Symmetry: D2
Subunit: 499 residues, 4 copies
C-alpha cells in the first residue's frame, strides 16, 4: 500500500462498503435527474435559465473561497486533548488546570508566516503553533509560535513588518530590499532574526518543534494573588530540523510536507505530544528584572526562572473536512477564562484587538458559531443578537437588554479581573532602544556552538546578499554591535557573494 493520507478516498469508500450511494440533490434538497448534462433546447441549442440544477451548483462553486489569513495562511491542523499532570493551582484558578488528570479537548493549527495558501511548508520562517482549549469557562486560545520571542516590541510596527516580509506592492515579488531595510532600521529584530536564521529556522515538520506563548502572561489564584508567567510546551518527539538542502528539495517535491507528516503520524497511531511548562515571575521580581519583563524581544533565563511542568498536549485525531475544521479555525488571544489574564506587553495588548477583528472580516460576524470555534464545553448566554448567518436559535425569546427584571443571564462577580495599579502620563513611550543586543550576543555565544554559528552566518549572508550595499552595511553594523565576530563573518561572506 501507500500512506494513509494517499488512501483517504479508498478508505472512505471502504468505510461505506455495503451501503449504496446516496441520492444527489440540489442545495435545497431537490433530487437531480442528471447532473452531468445541461438543460438546452435541442442537442446543440442554448442553455436555459430554467436549468436551476446548474445555477445552484455553479453559484456555490463561484463562492467557495474566503480570504486567507492575512498571516500564517499556509497551515495544517489536528485535534486532541490536554491533560493536567502537575498541580499549579497555587498560581492559577483556571478550571483547565483544576486538578491532575483533568482532560480538556483541544484544537491545534501549525503554520508558516509569510507565504500564501499555495506556498511550501519547508521554508525558513517562524512557525505558528496555536492551541485552543475548550474549557468549562469557555475557550482559551494560546496562540504561540515555535520561538519564545519576536522581531518587534510594539504592535504599530507589525503591519509594516509583515509587509516587508511579503510581496513588493508593484512587482508582487519577494523583496530582499524590503526585508533587510526594515530589519536594518529596527535593530530590535536581531534576537529573533538570529533564531530564525539558525537551524531552528526550518523545522522538520510540526512534530519536532517547540511551542511557546512568547508573551509574559498573568495568572491569578483563588485568593486573588497574581504572578506573571510564560507558557512553554516542549516537543516530546524532540527537536529536529531540515538542512537548507533537504528543505529546498522538499519545497518542490512536496510543498505540503508538514501537512502530510502530521496526518500520517496521527493516522498510524503515532500521536504527537508536547509537555506544557510555565516559568513564573512575581511582581516583585518583575520590578527588578534587568530588562523590561514584558519586552517580547527577550526571554526569562531558565536559571533564574526554572520551567515548571503543568500538563501534556496530545493530538490523536485528524480533521474530517479540512475547510470546515482547519481553514475556518479561529484563535483569539483575548479568549482567556478566569485565572489567566494578559500582561502589559505592548504586542500582546494589540493582539487582544487584532484577532477577533480580523476574524469578523475573514470569517464573518458570527464566526464564533462555526462548530470548530464554538465554546461547546461552556454555555454561551448573553445579550448579543442577530448578525449575518445567525445560526442556532439566536438565544430564542430571552430578554435582550441588561439589567432586566425577567431572569436573563447575570453577572459572575467571582469572574472579575485582577486589579493592578498603574501610574504615568498618557503618551507614546519610545521602546526602540530597550537593549537590542545583550540577549542576542548570548544566544550567539552560549546558545549556539561554533558550527551552528557557521551556518547562521551563511544563511544570513545568502539572503542579505540580494539587498543593496547600503542596506548590507547597516545590516552588518547591527550584527557587529551584538558581537564583532558576528558582523565580521557575515561581511566576509557578503564580500564573496558580492564577488
Amino acid at each position: 500500500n501507500r500512506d494513509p493520507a494517499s488512501d483517504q478516498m479508498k478508505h472512505w469508500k471502504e468505510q461505506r462498503a455495503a451501503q449504496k450511494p446516496d441520492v444527489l440533490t440540489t442545495g435545497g434538497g431537490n433530487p437531480v435527474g442528471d447532473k452531468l448534462n445541461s438543460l438546452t433546447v435541442g442537442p446543440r441549442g442554448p442553455l436555459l435559465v430554467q436549468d436551476v440544477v446548474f445555477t445552484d451548483e455553479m453559484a456555490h462553486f463561484d463562492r467557495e473561497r474566503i480570504p486567507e489569513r492575512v498571516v500564517h495562511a499556509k497551515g495544517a491542523g489536528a485535534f486532541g486533548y490536554f491533560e493536567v499532570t502537575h498541580d499549579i493551582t497555587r498560581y492559577s484558578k483556571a478550571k483547565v488546570f483544576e486538578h491532575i488528570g483533568k482532560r480538556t479537548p483541544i484544537a491545534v493549527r501549525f503554520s508558516t508566516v509569510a507565504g500564501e495558501s499555495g506556498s511550501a511548508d519547508t521554508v525558513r520562517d517562524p512557525r505558528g503553533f496555536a492551541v485552543k482549549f475548550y474549557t468549562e469557562d469557555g475557550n482559551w486560545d494560546l496562540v504561540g509560535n515555535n520561538t519564545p520571542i519576536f522581531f518587534i516590541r510594539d504592535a504599530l510596527l507589525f503591519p509594516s513588518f509583515i509587509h516587508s516580509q511579503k510581496r513588493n506592492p508593484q512587482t508582487h515579488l519577494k523583496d530582499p530590499d524590503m526585508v533587510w531595510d526594515f530589519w536594518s532600521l529596527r535593530p530590535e529584530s536581531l534576537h529573533q532574526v538570529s533564531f530564525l536564521f539558525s537551524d531552528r529556522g526550518i523545522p522538520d515538520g510540526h512534530r519536532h518543534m517547540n511551542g511557546y506563548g512568547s508573551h509574559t502572561f498573568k495568572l491569578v489564584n483563588a485568593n486573588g494573588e497574581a504572578v506573571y508567567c510564560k507558557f512553554h510546551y516542549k516537543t516530546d518527539q524532540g527537536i529536529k530540523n531540515l538542512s537548507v538542502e533537504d528543505a529546498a528539495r522538499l519545497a518542490h517535491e512536496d510543498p505540503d510536507y508538514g501537512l502530510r507528516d502530521l496526518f500520517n503520524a496521527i493516522a498510524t497511531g503515532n500521536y504527537p505530544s508536547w509537555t506544557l511548562y510555565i516559568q513564573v515571575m512575581t511582581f516583585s521580581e518583575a520590578e527588578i528584572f534587568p530588562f523590561n519583563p514584558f519586552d517580547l524581544t527577550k526571554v526569562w533565563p531558565h536559571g533564574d526562572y526554572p520551567l515548571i511542568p503543568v500538563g501534556k498536549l496530545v493530538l490523536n485525531r485528524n480533521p474530517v473536512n479540512y475547510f470546515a475544521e482547519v481553514e475556518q479555525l479561529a484563535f483569539d488571544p483575548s479568549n482567556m477564562p478566569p485565572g489567566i489574564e494578559p500582561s502589559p506587553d505592548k504586542m500582546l495588548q494589540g493582539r487582544l484587538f487584532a484577532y477577533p477583528d480580523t476574524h469578523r472580516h475573514r470569517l464573518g460576524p458570527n464566526y464564533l458559531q462555526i462548530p470548530v470555534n464554538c465554546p461547546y464545553r461552556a454555555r454561551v448566554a448573553n445579550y448579543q443578537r442577530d448578525g449575518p448567518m445567525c445560526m442556532m436559535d439566536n438565544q430564542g425569546g430571552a430578554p435582550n437588554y441588561y439589567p432586566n427584571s425577567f431572569s436573563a443571564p447575570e453577572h459572575q462577580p467571582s469572574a472579575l479581573e485582577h486589579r493592578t495599579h498603574f501610574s504615568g502620563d498618557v503618551q507614546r513611550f519610545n521602546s526602540a532602544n530597550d537593549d537590542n543586543v545583550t540577549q542576542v550576543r548570548t544566544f550567539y555565544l552560549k546558545v549556539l556552538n561554533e558550527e551552528q554559528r557557521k551556518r547562521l552566518c551563511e544563511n544570513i549572508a545568502g539572503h542579505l546578499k540580494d539587498a543593496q550595499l547600503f542596506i548590507q552595511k547597516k545590516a552588518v553594523k547591527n550584527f557587529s554591535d551584538v558581537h564583532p565576530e558576528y558582523g565580521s563573518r557575515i561581511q566576509a561572506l557578503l564580500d564573496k557573494y558580492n564577488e
Copy 2:
C-alpha cells in the same frame, strides 16, 4: 391583563420556574464579572483595549444588521403544516401530494411590498404570501402574493417597476410622478392596478386575504404526462379589508398591526388556515386559450377552469426569535421538487434566477444552511463544498467530484424534468401589447359592483392627483380604454382635486 404579544417577557420569565438565571458570558463562553462598568485606569481615567468584554459585545452590536429584502422588507411569519385532503396524484407525482392526510411542515411569511423595514403594515400595496414546504424531495417554495396577477409580464421591467414604487433617487421621497409615469407608460399594469386600488388593496391583517401562486406552473404525474396549473389558497377566515380611514389611523396607531394580529391569534389558539386549490389547463387548451396562458397579467376564468380542492394550510406556531426564523427566511421559486415545474411565464423564468441570487447577497453563500432555510425533511448530498460561514461538517471527507468510483452521491433519472418541445428564433419578443384591457373591463363592470367602483376611482384619484397633468392625461387614457366610464369617473375626481 394584556394580550399575549405584550406579555412576551412576562411569560419567558415565569416559564423558567425558579431556575437560577444563566451565567453571562462573552461570545467565547468566558464568564463576565461585571458587564455594567468599563475597564479604566482610575474612576475618571481612559478606557483600556484590555477590556475585551466591551469589545466583544460592542463589535457584535456593531454587526447586528443585514441588508433588508430589496422588496417585501416589512413582514411577519408563522409556522405550521400542510395537509392533503384530496387526491390530485392524477396531475402531480410530487411527494407533498402523496396521499390524503399526509402532512408537511410549512413556514410562512406575509409582507407589504414597497415600504422598508420600519414602515407601517396597514398601507395600500400588494401582500406577499410565501409558503415553504419542507418535503422529502427537498423544499418546495411557493412564493405567492395576495393577488392572482401582477403589474407586468416581463422580468426586465421588474427593477424599474420597483424603483418607481420606492423613493426618488435624489430626495428620497415617495414620488407620485415616478409611480404614474411608469404605469401610464405601461398599460399592462391596468389589471393589477385595478385590484390594488379596490378594497382588497388594504387587507385587515394577514389572516383575511387569499394567497395565489399567480404564475402558471406545470404539474407532472408518475406516467410522465404533463398539465399546466395555477395555485390558489383561500382564507378560511374570510376576506376582510380595512377602510382607507382606519388604515391611515393604524399606520401611526400601530405600524405593526399585522404582526400583532397574527402573533396574538396563534398565541390564543385561534390558528388561521387556508384551503389550497388548483386550476388545471391541458397543453391542448393552452394552444387555443384566447390569451397567453403564461401572461402574468391574466387570470384563468373559473368558469372554464374551476378550482380543484387539494389540501389545507394551517399556521399554529409563532416564531421564537424573529430575526433567526423570519428575517432570515429565504424562499426560492426555483425550489421545486419532482412533479412540479415552471412554465414559460417570462416573469417566473426571471424569478428562477433572482431569489437564490439575492439570498446569496442578503444572507450569504451558505444561507440554505441557516436552520429555517434547511430542507431538514430531506437528505442533502452533492458535490458542493466550502463557502463562508460553513456549518455542518461540510459533508466530511466524501469524494467531491462527480462522477467518481468511490460511492459518493448519484443522480437519479426518476427526477428528470418533463420534456416540452420548442421551436423559434432567439429574440426579444415584444409583449407590451398582449391585450391590456379585455380582462380589466370584466373586472371593473362584471366583477365589481357600483358601491366599490366608486371607491376604486376615488382611491386612484386620491393618489394620481399629485402627478403632473400630462401624466394624469395619459393615465386617464388607459383607464378609458378599459371603459369610458372608468376613465371619465377618474377624470371628474381629478378635476375637483386640481381645484
Copy 3:
C-alpha cells in the same frame, strides 16, 4: 408648479433639454438593444442564460441594499460650509479654527434613533445631528445630537439600552416593558428621559433644533496647553416643536416630513444655519466641578461656563444622489485633527472604537474611499494597502513598510497628542450611583414652566401606562426621587389610565 422636491424629475429633464438622451448600457458599458423584453426561444418560449442584459441588471438590483445603520437609520442629509466668526486660537490650534472668516466644507446628516429605515420622522425620539468638517488636517467628525446629555454614562450599557428601545426579540413589536424596565433599573437616565418627553421630544423638522457634542472634549493650543470643552450649535431659525397630536397626524400623512422640509428649505434658498459655541473648563476647574465633568448625564451650567462664540454652520446644498451621499455617509468621533482630542468620558471612549468598526461592516473595509467620506481637503498618505473594493491607485508603488530608507511618508511630531497624567488601579469602577437627580430637579423646576411640566408628565404617563405595574412603581419611585411633585403628578395620570 409644486414644491422643489416634487419637481425633482421635471427639473432634471429641463436642465437636460435639447440634449440627446444617452445610450442605455450594461454595467460593462455594452449598448443594449431592447431592455424591455427578455431573450427567449420563440414568443412563448424559455428564458436564455444568454440573456446577459437581464442578468447584469437583475444581479445588481438583487444587490442594491446594504445593512441600515444599527441606530439612527432614518435620516436626512445636506451640505454646506463652516465659517469661523470668532477667535478661539488660545484654546485650539486646530486648522479649522485658524482665522476669522475661514471656510471649511461640511456634510451633515440629521436623524431619529430607534426607528428603522422606513419609519416616520415626526416621532418622539432624540435627534442625531452629525457634522463632518473636511479640514486640511483631515476630517473632523462632530457626531452630535439635539441634546447636551444622554441616557447612560458607560458604553457597556449602550447595546442594551438600544435593544430596550427597539423591538421585542420574539414578536418584533415595540415593547414598553423593555423600555421602562431598563429605564426603571438605571435612574441615571432620568435627565435625558425628562428632556426626551418635554416639547423638545419632537422637533419641528431638523431646522428648528440645536446640536450638541454632548461629551466633554479636550482642546489644545499651539503652546501645548489643554482645556476641556463642550460644543454647542444653536439654531438660527429658533426652537420649534410639533405638538403630540400634530406629530401623530404627520406620522402617517408624511413619514418623511423632516426630509422634505430640509430639501425644500435649501432648494428655495432658505439656507438653515447654526451658531457654533464652546464652553471651556480648565483642568483646575474640572478638578472642583460639583459632578464628574466627564459624566454624559450632566451639563455644565451656563452661568459658570458661558457659551463662547466660534462660528457658523450653513447648509446650502442638497444631495444629488441620496444613497451615495447620505445613506453611505460615515461619521467617526475618532476623526479628530490636531488641536481636538477626547476627554476621559467613558461613553466617548467607547465611541472611539464603535463607529469605525460598524462602518467597516455596514459599508466595507475601504468606506473612507467612498467620495463623501474621503478627506478630500487633505492628502491621505500612509502604509495601509489593499482590502475589498480598493479604489484609486492604492498608493501606487510607494514603499509599504515603515520605517524605510526610500522616502515614503513620515509622521509629524507636531501632531503628537497632549500628555495628561493618569494614576489609579485598573478596574471596573461603578458609576451607577453618580448623582442621578440633582440636575434633573433643576431641570424640572427651574428649566421648565408649569405649562411644560404638565404635558411632560402626560407624555411620560401616556407611554409608561402600558408597562407592567411593578415597573410603573419603580419608574415613579425614580421620578419622586427627583422631586415628589414629579413622581406624584405621574402617578395621578397613571392611576387614571389604568381605568
Copy 4:
C-alpha cells in the same frame, strides 16, 4: 545595480527627486505624531482604546485580504494596446475592428489553474490568457487559455473537474486518485490531457505561448449576416517550453518566475506581442462539420479553416500597484460588444453566468466600478443603482425607471442580438460520447513526433503511477482507444514505476 524588478523601490525613491516626503496620516487624513510607539499609561502600562492611530491602521491591515480566484489564482498582469492590421469588417461590425490601424487599450492577465496564490509559476497546468479590450461599445473580455481546447464539454462537470484537480477535502493534499479517477471516467478529457502532458504543459514564462478563445463564437456584420469563428493570438516571441527538470528547479528557486520575467521584459522595453487571427465557419459548414462544431474538445483543422489575420496585441506597461490593477482585475466572457456574440457551446453558455457571478462575490456587487474594471472608453448609463461601496455619483438624480418621460437613457435597436433559430425538446442531451478519440489520435500521431510522444508518455506515467491500479487500468484503456501504442507505451512505463 540589478534587474528592473529588483530595483522597484530604488527607482521609486529616485523618482521623487528631492521632493519632501508626504505627511503620514490616518485613513481619515489626520496627521500622525508617532506611528512607531503605542499609546499607554506609563512606559510599561496598558494600551488605550484612545490610540486611534493604532486601531485605524491595524483594522485595515486585518482586512487586506479578499478571496483569491476560485481557479487561476496565481498570475501576472500587464497593459498595452490592440491594433488592427487587417480588415475583417465583412465578418464583424464590432467597433474594435472598425478600421486598420485602430488602437484600443487592453489589460491582460496570465495565470496557472490549480495552484493557490502562493503556488509556483513553473508547473504543468494549462495557462490563463485573458485579454480585456476597453472599447467604445464597452469592454470586450476575451478570456482565453494557452490551448484551443479543454478537458470537458458541459459546464455541469466544471466544478467537479476543478475539485478533482485541487486538494483532497480531508487531507488538503493533491490527490492523484481524484485527478485520474475523474479523467479515466470522462475520456472526453483525452484531447486536452494530451496537450497538457506534452511540452506545452510547461511554457517558459508567459511571453512564449499562444492564446486561444477556445470556444467557437459568433461574429455579426453590418448586414445582419453571421458566421462562427475561433480566436487565436500566436506569440511573436515564438513557442518556448521549460524542461520538466528545469521547471522543478525554478519551482523552488523562483516560484514567481513568470511574474518576474514579464515585468522585466516590459521594464527593459522588450514588449511582448501576439498576432491575432480568426478561423471562420459559415452556418452551412457548421451543419456539415464531422463533429459538433461547438464541442470544446474539438479544434477546427487549419487546412479546412485557415487562420485569417486581424491585428496585434502588445503589452508595454507594467502595473504600478499589483493588487489594485491585477488582483482586482475581472474578466467576464459575457462582456461582448455588438458584432461579437456567443455560440451554443455548452461550456461557453455556462461561463456567461459564472464570471460576473463569482466577481460579485470575490470583489463585490460594484466590482465594475473598480478603475481597472471600468469601461472607461465608454459612457455607462442605465437604470442600475446603489449597492455596497457605490462610487462616483451613482448616476446622480437621473430618473431610475425605464421607460420614462424624463429623457433618461434609451436602448438602441442597432445593438439587438443576431437572430438564430432553434427547434427541439427541452432536455439534458448527453454529450459524453461525442467522439472522444478521433482528433486525439491525430494529435498523438501527426502533431507530435516520436521524441515528443516519448516524453508525453513518460510525463503521464510519472503522475498516473501514483493512482490506484484499477484507476491506472481504466485510464490506460482510454489511451488505448486513442491508439494501441499510446496506451501500451504508458502501460510499459507504469509496469516499471509500479516496481
